[PDB]
Copies of this chain bind each other. A is one copy, B any other.
């Protein structure tokens, strides 16, 4: 449901994700990272799949954050792909990819992969 996703979420590293799920499948908000060459909030945009999920199935979604704002420019972007699972303790379990802009020669080492779990606190 859009509502269920809308809110303030935090992950294990201490980063903040503030999101609004819109009626048409859109996700917009800001992300505050606790790691990296990140300073302040960054704009995020994503999409989620408005499932008829009468299976106890999670809702698939994903979003992107380009690490550039008015204070810093890290020349990198991260995409998180995962699913939202609601209940008393709603969680968003994700796997992410962080690509840094590089010269052709270092391209082979341009992408990091990891996983983050988000816990909701506010709507």
Q: Which A residues form the contact surface with B (CB < 8 A)?
A: 13, 24-27, 35, 43-53, 55-68, 73-83, 85, 93-104, 107-115
Contacts and interface: CB of A to CB of B under 8 A. Distances in A.
Residue from the set A25, A53, A57, A99 with the largest chain B CB neighbour count within 10 Å: A99
B101 A59 contact: yes
24 contacts: A24-B43, A25-B43, A49-B101, A51-B101, A52-B73, A52-B75, A53-B75, A57-B75, A57-B102, A58-B102, A58-B107, A60-B66, A60-B67, A60-B76, A62-B64, A62-B78, A63-B64, A78-B81, A81-B97, A83-B102, A95-B97, A95-B111, A95-B114, A97-B113
Contact of A75 (B51, B63, B112): B51
Given A83-B110, A113-B111, A99 B60 contact: yes
